[model samples]
Target: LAPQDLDLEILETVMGQLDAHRIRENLRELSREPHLASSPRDEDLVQLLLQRWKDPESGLDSAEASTYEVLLSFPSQEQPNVVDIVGPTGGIIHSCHRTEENVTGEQGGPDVVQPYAAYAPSGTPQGLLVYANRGAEEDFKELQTQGIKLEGTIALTRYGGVGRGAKAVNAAKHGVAGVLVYTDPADINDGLSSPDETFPNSWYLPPSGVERGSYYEYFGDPLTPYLPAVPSSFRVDLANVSGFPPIPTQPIGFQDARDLLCNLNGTLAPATWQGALGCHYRLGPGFRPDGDFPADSQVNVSVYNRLELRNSSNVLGIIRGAVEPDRYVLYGNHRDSWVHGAVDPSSGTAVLLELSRVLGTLLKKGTWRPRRSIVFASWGAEEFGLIGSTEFTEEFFNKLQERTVAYINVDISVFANATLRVQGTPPVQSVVFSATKEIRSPGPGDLSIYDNWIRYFNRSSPVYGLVPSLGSLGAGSDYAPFVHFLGISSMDIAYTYDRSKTSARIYPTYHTAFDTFDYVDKFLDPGFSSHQAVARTAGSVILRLSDSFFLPLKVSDYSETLRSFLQAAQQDLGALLEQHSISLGPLVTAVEKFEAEAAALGQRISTLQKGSPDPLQVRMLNDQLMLLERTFLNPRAFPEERYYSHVLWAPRTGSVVTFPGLSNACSRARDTASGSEAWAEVQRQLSIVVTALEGAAATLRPVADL
Candidate 1:
């Protein structure tokens, strides 16, 4: 009675009711008719509970508590209400204009302070705001190297590039008073707001819409940097909050920031230092925009710091495998976000839900059976770091490490009908490409789903027909724990890199309050055209993964990518040596050896492509694939070496990975989970990559998805 194929007939029928446009209609009704509510459904009711397995603490964790309340409170079909979607393009990007009060205040500079009235006696101070550009660590380092005094000065950074936690921790170390983050239209400016951008060319936020959420770095984050497992957990403090005790932080719109910038007058900043705002940017040890902070700014910030931790378990709905129940191929979306994150986590989460429903229906109808268990997980704590998934992995580390085949992490998907952007190791990329190649896309004016989506988003697709999906891995999602930490093979799929060749993460409202239900439906969701596209594309992933044969993993890519890396390394050897001020002999020799071994592995995959791969090879290749991501891990991908951190991929890539609102404790460097030294980190990463390359040399069985 095992299932063979999905009940696509039923999937197609149900999917019709879930259009992105229909979702907007539903949301409008909810907003316009919040009152004429009916009785809550039984499934919407949930009770607070605790998990016995995890290290117990006094109160619940933020993710757990949030999940407990939401899951126990909403309809199973809509337990995704935790996601917030607010928009109308989330305001102009890289734009910094001042509100009326801010205009009068004359903001920024060291000695100056502008104080405004607050509910409390001490209100926030506004002073010489240092335009830390993106508030990146490099920016802070420049301030130090150039002797920029940040004390008593507020640091203004833009959203995107780095996480808030990374920003806060870096600033606090530099002695910043407070932080003001803004969304600039220049970055997202898309030339839409430029002079040529007709008066009606660009759009702005609707009234009653304010940028949502604070840019506050999580306290525990810049501190202990680990699970204390207690309510009164206090691993560190602000003043001595390790690197730099991060001070008060806040976020403003591009308009407010413009005013802060315009009021400045000091040493004109460098050419590259300029922003979209028309004015010579300046560093203020002297200029006073909000007048010198007459006094140190003190603002009371009361937050739900103590999250109500609940014992919530990930529902791993499964169709037990006929041959290997222990072996798993999982693809699930975290069923959580800040608001009705319908587009973010829900967009993919809904597809996974449909996957479950489809599988369930298929089982009843007797479609097909699989060799390995296909698990659909609604992981918790994905937002407040990959805590839930990490914790689960930590709990089941040994077995899942060996048995798990591939994990397809899902988050922030929309129906773009464009070439899917993928990030992963070589093995997974090969499988993904195979899937794409097999799908016969609609041709010319057939109104292909992708074309439909392009018109819907008013953008262009970089990929022309069935494109080879991208496979880059930049941490901060569920995949972090799976592949990076454990060296588990995996791939991440998402759809919003802007089809018109726009900058990624240009969606200004990201990780902000505007990431609410309202924003997704009206502005983000695919509506009539793209929703089915998501369903179809995501369905392809599910259908392919749940099959019996080994998905064609491109073992050859490992060698090819290795060849490229070696070439880059060799060409840069002189520069790298000069930069590091080290002898090139030892390093060059080591790299040469690494490249040779990598080439052999690549050769195996190339030769092994003709026949079914050996099981031994498949297993080992998967392991090696996992290591490619981990190899980049040894010295850390960012400027600072964080041996192991949240979010699977590199840290410096910018583009926020996790969620909006919650802080990403990005930097605090630690040894790998095994606690190895930096050199050891590199060696370990190299070893993993080598093994995967060798695995690709072995044979693999291929099964085509009909």
Candidate 2:
């Protein structure tokens, strides 16, 4: 039964069974300890999560395992880690996160590892400090524009605006000796409040709250990138890896950042470079307020990481479908975090677990049965750059590529009771839109989630104000492997404040020790309504995907999305489009035809006689749409980007209907400095994408006609 066609009683009963109290219980138990990826806590959470999925009342058939021998790392404490300021006369002051205690609040225990960036080189480096606002590529360019040589300086930056590691990467590229990324109070949500009231009282990050994460870009064990982390896999030398960094990188709270940055001397930073930490922002290589270079002043940064090959397991619970057990619908959330990741991941975990319980309850009692198998996954080592999920995807590469229908991922399921945010492959957008319209909004007015969602954007749609525009998939989650590597349609859904209010609503403790149960209990989702809403959304997505008689995909929406992407790209490269004679016409023309084919196919299925759909033709058409994402795969393209096999959805890039592809193309063009060679590469790659879209349309035409 399609979700829109499901018996309302059964759907409501199942969704109603999703108790917010249960979400709280599970989240509390999981967040009680610091579950660093691959640690004993990580393993403990794994067993607990596995047990929940296996409960007869939980609705799972059996647990399946894919264990990989992978290299994992923790910050070494044999010698205490440090990031401190050294005065001109060599007096050490403002020792940052170097204290024996590393965390705060009820969850902060002595056993927590000191704050350190994962995968950062274990080394000690001291130098003059340069205050680079966010460490983005442009931020570095501005420093270069100002003639500030970063060769021997510790590049300090605030966390936000882009990926944290990218900050360090840009710095390393500019010959920085070390990197220090800190949470600038200005960047926190409550920045306008001079001193942000923090956890236990509010959601803002406290002074000692240091954001920790992996500096490496690629998912999985750093040693095992392109292939699975199986015992027999050939491991790449860590030093030669493309995404791994060389310089030592550390994270600090604003307290330490201010102590070090207070001494900086240089020109007043560009207005955009200012942070909310009360210091006049400066573009310094070390200087005093008058822009005079201070004699022998410096900031020292030290990082120590412990690396070793170890056993990491991915726990999956499978519930076989009644009709097509071979086909799969996957739902995943990372099991591990930098601390007790109440918001970063555990919130999502809570929703997933509650969903498991509700689904299991309905099925065990014979109230429901899906048409396709569903796999609920709790992946370990995700905080280490999606390691656990990537390894699992790599190990089951063939089976997953053959049978997996779609992957729905929820990372931070709830931070606040806000509007919904979903970014993914276009096929998944319609499913979420349909699902949201059926559920009650957590907000006021007794509105549907779709109504509230559209209202939050303060926009109306001609068809339905709630028309969802699926943003292109980008890196930073479990979906990367499924969509980018294996070409499965995938998405990441979350409950978030309107992005325009990001600074006002961005979760302050993201990746920090402060991302604990205390903050979540006090300010974020205190009533757990957000959790329930997400559960409803997530469960609706899974059920709709699993139960639909035909694949509930909207390829016509994808065509329009593609057109939008092409239009945006054309505007971005206006002169280049003219200079290189780059015509987006082929890609544009291809999608127009693609749209017609998809519309006809959808209409044909929608018009099926009541209670008399043809099973043989249904399966045939289903198979074609289910594997549509795979058609965009070009494993041999961009061999240098070994892990990215999809021509459309590669990490950090892509075109309209297929981003991350459009974003990827933009990244590549930017990489080439938009020179003739770079523009030529963009044109060549775009030609291939146009051809792919045309081929996809052709593939669909034949199947629909049959």
Candidate 3:
């Protein structure tokens, strides 16, 4: 049989074996209890995964668990964090609830953790309140423009526009003593602020729902930066870490936020600062003098979160390759959750388990084996800051850098299932496109997932007409460590809501107690068809990445992406750079060289004989393809941010679309005059990017050229 025909047969068998009912059952079992990282319940889930992977009838070749001792933070259940309105006469006017009210009544178990920002230091900060919309950097700038003094104030900020941690970081920079973060109905509930309008009624955040998350910017063990969190590893002191919130921070429900926002008494907030909260928002340095108990009332934020060293484990299972045992294709999802996390993580975990079982069944029959090894990971401590996955990369740094073909993360396999969402490095885009084309969409119609995806989300590409565009990977999930720290090509796959149909931000129950089995089974994916769809698409990607005689990664896609990046940089920064006499010529030359090398490699691959090719030549060619992404790594690119080593595609906070290093340099240069130190730094960054691109082009060249 032709190789393509053989691959399609195996793909069909695997896809046919995926059962929606089984995936639903798996999700129910995995999310039955609240399993925070490093807890006994998390360990039980780990053992359950081990049992499934070690089963003789339908398991992998081997399965095991590894442990890491890392620093993690948790709120004290006995003395839960609190926020209160204190009158000038030392009287408490109102107190906020520490736990989300069980609006569903079916939500929380006894072990449910209360609402508090992880990594928030234990402190009680009291100050006059100020309404700082979103607490983004620009929000504070606007506050200053409105003549509001931020020093010694507690900021009331909504949860959007930035990372949860960045809110506090921005507030602290202005000498703010504490910060309170809440989800505004405008952002998460689509302007529906009432109780009846949310959650059990619709997939929107209720008034009392508080979004809980890790309040730190960096990933991995904060105590052990840039290293594995092993027993014998050297640890850094907490005092030396820069990204932690300098002031105390807490997350409150919008109900609690309204009590503080409605009484503000400074300048009226800008038009865009208005939220769905029932009030004319204001940029106040104090409460309303006419309405409140007193003109000097203050808001007090008390956080009792403490840091501890806890042991977290990663459960791993591997299917050894029949032909190339050294090469690997990795798929991972975090096992821990903020609550029951039925939708956030367990959904993805369930899909992973079902895919493993189906693939194991084929291996057990001795009828099929991949060309490259496949490794499945259930990472721990992901909720804290991607600790488990980051440490895993650090521990196996050398081997992974040399052997890994790609890393695929399925953190939340389905959010609402209206459409397919994918974010990845450019090399893995073609395989993902291929996989989605074969799976049926869960929505009405006989359309493929690819058809539904393009319908919901697409861009006009001059070369390919209208195609479903993939998103760039940001530091939001388990894929962060692999693509950012190790330069491995990676992708994150999920089924998500169509934004045009709903303005709800992030499937409203996210990080709340209401993200449960019932919530998902009823509203998110009624029949678990979306889960099955994801399993098939992701499984198909793994099979193709593992079994193809020549790796299926598209070199042309990457070259095209580079061309776009170059064009964007020139268009955005060309005038300003020309004024400063800083030429973009070297960068343009490097991209041209890369395009030429990519075309040459594509020509060679197209002309290969159908029957047979030289084994050594094929290995060398594949090795070049695998190492192409690795050449983009520049250890010195981000001096302040060591984890972001990918010179081209590292994550940034604001909305800059060019190359990351060049964008950052230009941002600083814009703030300073030409020929200033900032301008010099921009020139330095340009050199680094040009060198990295040249190095990447060299990898695509033939061995004789090198």
Candidate 4:
């Protein structure tokens, strides 16, 4: 498993395409994709909102109404509070929201009349349903970057980053009203058969069903979370809105989503643009509504439900540091699934369990000890708007800021094959880039293996080098909190598939009752190569992170990626800066200056590679470099074009409307685009990414020169 022992030339590990034994283990368990998700008649978000709203002790009344919207709990339906369901063996230790219910979701006083009647009021009862893939502004821009369009259409987002609600709200502000979210199989392959082993289902998500309230992201100012609510104006709750897509959308299963996706027709989706569905994908706005859908039609959404609420909790375990106990590096994942979630979260949870156990064992073995503290957690209420992670983070903000080193988040280890998705906190870019480069290859990045896999599956080349397996940095992971807000260093990890590896991914039962270990071993485990790859890669990451010498956080990847975003936004950006007061040239000029500074720093670090003469200089430069990482955390850096606070600025895909909003703001700011929004969604992602890179380079400019 070490780099030297890895047979990179052998090219043996085929991702997603594992051996037959594991496939059989998966197939042994079977299950049908559950249709438990429903419209207005059974909508839970809608119900949670109305109830959470007039509650007194919750302090929602005194607070801004939009703030209430951001804080509403919709995911509690499937994962009402967190609980301990730690796996039996070597799995990573992840946190789970042990919240029983929303303190205010349940009607405190009397029975309130719900909004939508059980039976939809006909005429395409409307709401929103998003793909839930790394729910961020970047993934959303993929459609735009590829020249695909889907304005005004509601999206079904996924459950990841504590920013799901923020993504949803931003989507709405960008003109996407109703947002339905689900946990993707890639992230949480619950499709593996569950409960019983005689069937299979490899596409289900965790039990934290989509109904959980995740709309608390855009807190203060409904239109702009950066700004506090302007009391002079009234807050407009989408649920309360008369004709918007039934308000506070929810998540859905792949099966439930098939109709909508299949119905889509826009820009021909590039090969990799497709998800687990077997249909030709398209970027959509349905420019030609002809065969698209009904005239502005919709699916009824009544999120109203009994949200018997309670305080969310987390599953925490730790190893006291030998040196700096206060300095911490946190690792965690969400608990509580839509049902008996074996994949969406369980898989990641399983990996975390392995991580925790392995480390615990190592602790006992005394093979290694760290100078900094390590905190392992199983985040709860993640399904319900990142309730547990965010709350815990907010509660520990000051302490973490003072001592935290980095936080690595791993969600959705369902694919039987893949590697660590080291994406997030631009500062970590250097560390991850170095780490990944040194980490043993799970599969060869050779064009031959990639070509074969693409041909076998008939998928297109992902812009990234890794065959369909590389993680995208769109929003939708637990990394959003630290990476976006505090600009903390982080990474997300996952796997992908190929034809021969298809059997490894044979569990069509992802999010269904079929998502169980028996099914996982049969249809998806393949040769256990994917899981093995993840474990090995994660082990490498742990080892690297545990090292005492400050690792070199490179900026090459960040540099190239930033330039790409700049070019992608060039045309429209040219137009945005056409204003009389602003000069777009200086914007790019600023980037050029920043890039030069970064390059200089890289050279300095390279020189220091042989030895370190000045520890104080290294420390000071590193501290400044760390501070630079926060530049992108500023929401103003990615302000909407119309909201340009400064006169001299070029609009580089602000809020996804401007590309560079997500992936170069190409369209993902989300996934299905790639993976890890790392820490996407806090600000307009493109600019934030740009700012992160700029900061990384600028802060280290002085140090690099030394």
lDDT values, one for every candidate: 0.45, 0.76, 0.88, 0.43
lDDT agreement of model 1 with the native: 0.45
Pick by TM-score: which candidate is best? 3
The predicted structure with the larger TM-score, 3 or 4, is 3
- Candidate 1 Cα RMSD after full superposition onto the native fold (Å): 11.6
Off by over 4 Å in 2: 1-5, 87-94, 99-104, 192-196, 289-295, 458-468, 498-505, 570-575, 609-611, 651-679, 704-706
Error of 1 at 34 (Å): 13
Question: Considering lDDT, which of the candidate structures 1 and 3 is the better prediction for this target?
Answer: 3
Model 4 C-alpha lDDT per residue in residues 1-706, reported as the tens digit of each score:
2111112221222222222333233222211121122222112322332333223422121111111122222222332221111222423222222211112132111121211111111122133223323446666666446653345455655455434345555565455645555444444442332223223233333332222322443211122233222233343553442222223454454434545555554566555445544456554543225644442334333243333233334555556666456656677666544433455555665565555544554455544455456676666545544445555555566676556667777766645443333445444644444434443454556423223233333322223444322333443556655655455556776555543433323234343333445545555555555555555455455545554445445543445545544565565545433431223454476568677877776677667656644545554544554445444455455444322221112233344333234433333332322233432342244445445545555665664453
State how far residue 472 of model 1 sits from its true place (Å): 1.5
2 or 4: which has the higher TM-score? 2
Across residues 1-706, which tens digit of lDDT does each residue of candidate 1 receive?
A: 4223333454344344334443344334322211100112111211111121111221111112222211011111211101111123332212222121211121122111111100011123434456777778888787767687887667777666666556666777777766666656556554233323411122222111123332323311233343322334454443353332235454555555565555554566666667665456666543453542221222222111221233333545566776556777777666544433445455665555444444555554554555567766666545555545655665566777666777887676652334345667655755555444433333235544433333423322222333343545655578876765566667776655444665534343443333444455555543523444444555555555555344444444444445444444345333432443334344334444554555565565567656767656554554443334333333232224322432224333312232110002211112233233443433333343344333323222121212
Residue 361 of model 4, lDDT score: 48
Clashes of each: 83, 21, 0, 170
| Every model: Cα RMSD to truth | 11.6, 3.2, 1.6, 14.9
lDDT tens string, model 2, 318-393?
A: 8888888888999999888887788889999988888988887778888778889988998878887788888887
User: Which residue ranges in model 1 land beyond 4 Å of their true spot?
Assistant: 1-127, 141-148, 189-245, 277-280, 285-313, 415-419, 438-469, 497-501, 516-518, 525-528, 574-706
Ranking by TM-score: 3, 2, 1, 4
User: Cα lDDT for residue 623, model 2?
Assistant: 77
